Amino acid sequence: GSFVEMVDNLRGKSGQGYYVEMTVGSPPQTLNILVDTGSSNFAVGAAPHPFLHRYYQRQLSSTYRDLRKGVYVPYTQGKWEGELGTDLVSIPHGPNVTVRANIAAITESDKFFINGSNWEGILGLAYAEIARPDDSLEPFFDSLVKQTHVPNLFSLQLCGAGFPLNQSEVLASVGGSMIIGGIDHSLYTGSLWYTPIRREWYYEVIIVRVEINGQDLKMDCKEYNYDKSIVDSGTTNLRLPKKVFEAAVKSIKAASSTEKFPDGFWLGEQLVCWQAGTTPWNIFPVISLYLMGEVTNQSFRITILPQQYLRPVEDVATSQDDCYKFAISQSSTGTVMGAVIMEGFYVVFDRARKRIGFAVSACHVHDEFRTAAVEGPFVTLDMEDCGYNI
Numbered sequence: 046g047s048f049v050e051m052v053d054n055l056r057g058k059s060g061q062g063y064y065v066e067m068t069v070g071s072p073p074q075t076l077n078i079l080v081d082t083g084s085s086n087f088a089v090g091a092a093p094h095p096f097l098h099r100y101y102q103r104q105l106s107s108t109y110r111d112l113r114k115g116v117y118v119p120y121t122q123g124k125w126e127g128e129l130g131t132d133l134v135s136i137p138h139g140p141n142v143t144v145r146a147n148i149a150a151i152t153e154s155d156k157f158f159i160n161g162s163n164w165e166g167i168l169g170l171a172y173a174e175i176a177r178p179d180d181s182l183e184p185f186f187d188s189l190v191k192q193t194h195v196p197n198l199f200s201l202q203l204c205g206a207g208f209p210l211n212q213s214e215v216l217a218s219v220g221g222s223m224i225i226g227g228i229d230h231s232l233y234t235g236s237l238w239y240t241p242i243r244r245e246w247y248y249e250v251i252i253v254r255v256e257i258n259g260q261d262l263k264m265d266c267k268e269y270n271y272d273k274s275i276v277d278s279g280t281t282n283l284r285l286p287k288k289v290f291e292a293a294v295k296s297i298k299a300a301s302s303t304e305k306f307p308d309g310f311w312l313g314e315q316l317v318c319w320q321a322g323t324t325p326w327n328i329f330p331v332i333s334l335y336l337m338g339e340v341t342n343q344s345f346r347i348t349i350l351p352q353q354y355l356r357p358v359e360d361v362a363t364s365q366d367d368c369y370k371f372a373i374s375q376s377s378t379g380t381v382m383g384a385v386i387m388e389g390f391y392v393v394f395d396r397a398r399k400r401i402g403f404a405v406s407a408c409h410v411h412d413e414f415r416t417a418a419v420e421g422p423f424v425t426l427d428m429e430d431c432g433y434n435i
């Protein structure tokens with residue numbers, strides 16, 4: 046690992062998001078910021094909110110610049126309205142650089158901030174094409190690269206604990222690493238495999254094959270990417286296109302049929318619990334996602350375990366049972382490879398080479414019999430046809 050200053054700079058959990066500490070303004074104002082590869086705006090709470098114990102105070106920053114422009118961002122989950130400006134931004138546990146970046150000062154929000162998440166803002170790491178108001182508002186990472194010598198690349202190691210973290214534990218626990226400008230080898234085992242970034246807007250990728258315990262889900266691969274497939278740290282679940290979700294659930298139910306689970310479980314709404322330590326991991330199937338490789342007619346696969354797609358949750362009775370929620374859900378906006386999927390891997394966002402790399406995470410949760418995996422190569426034909434076109 047050559048980036049020790051950035052290793053272990055993340056806190057949080059899949060259910061409430063992973064955040065990195067940042068400073069805004071002069072003198073610096075410290076804020077915890079949600080790492081979101083699924084959006085492109087840098088925005089921070091800038092007015093009192095019931096879920097915020099701190100916020101950006103523009104009148105206290107000598108370097109604050111008002112853009113005299115409003116901004117609105119509607120996410121899948123919630124939304125916020127704010128005021129645009131720029132100011133000096135740093136990442137304490139990151140590259141030792143200070144950059145002037147666009148900042149949306151959040152003045153109004155609905156279902157955006159999360160009670161107890163400990164974060165007060167969001168760092169949209171995707172491309173300008175999806176930035177609000179429009180693509181002229183330069184994203185933070187673009188500013189970082191244009192203004193410094195930092196390589197146009199970042200990597201994420203999201204670490205799920207494999208068990209419930211209470212309010213105090215999640216504040217003291219290391220949730221992962223965001224390596225800005227590089228790849229730290231201590232964060233993964235084995236080889237890194239790269240899939241093409243199809244288009245620079247979201248971190249869009251193409252899934253060419255899906256397996257549940259080695260069994261081909263056998264759908265037209267275009268279904269897997271309808272209307273797109275993205276890598277998104279800002280979403281908890283693996284979200285799948287309606288038809289793929291239905292087929293995936295049917296297959297996961299069949300593989301786990303030795304035990305019956307209530308419909309509420311499969312809807313990702315109700316928890317299932319087992320006596321401490323008795324979770325029957327082995328009855329649940331591994332899920333393999335084949336991704337287009339960088340070599341013509343070649344793919345590789347990432348394999349996740351139920352330790353990734355079953356999300357640890359505290360029993361409504363706080364008992365000693367090990368409880369979980371099914372972290373795979375239905376999408377109407379394409380595949381979303383959320384945090385529970387990213388927790389199994391070290392993910393490299395190689396903007397410079399327009400590719401996303403995957404390697405087995407040194408912190409993924411597993412058992413003595415199975416491990417997450419990244420394997421290749423596989424002969425795969427007509428992968429370009431798996432991509433969706435409106």
Ligand SMILES: CCCN(CCC)C(=O)c1cc(C)cc(C(=O)N[C@@H](Cc2cc(F)cc(F)c2)[C@H](O)[C@@H]2NCCN(Cc3ccccc3)C2=O)c1
Nearest residue numbers: 060061062083084120121122123156157175279280281282
């Ligand atoms: C329940 C609270 C949020 N959580 C738990 C903690 C992560 C989720 O798992 C979750 C679930 C859904 C169904 C949607 C989003 C969601 O909208 N995520 C977006 C970011 C986000 C994180 C939050 F913690 C709260 C929010 F309100 C929003 C992300 O950019 C997502 N990524 C894919 C594209 N879009 C839409 C979009 C399109 C263009 C530009 C910007 C955003 C998105 O919103 C997040």
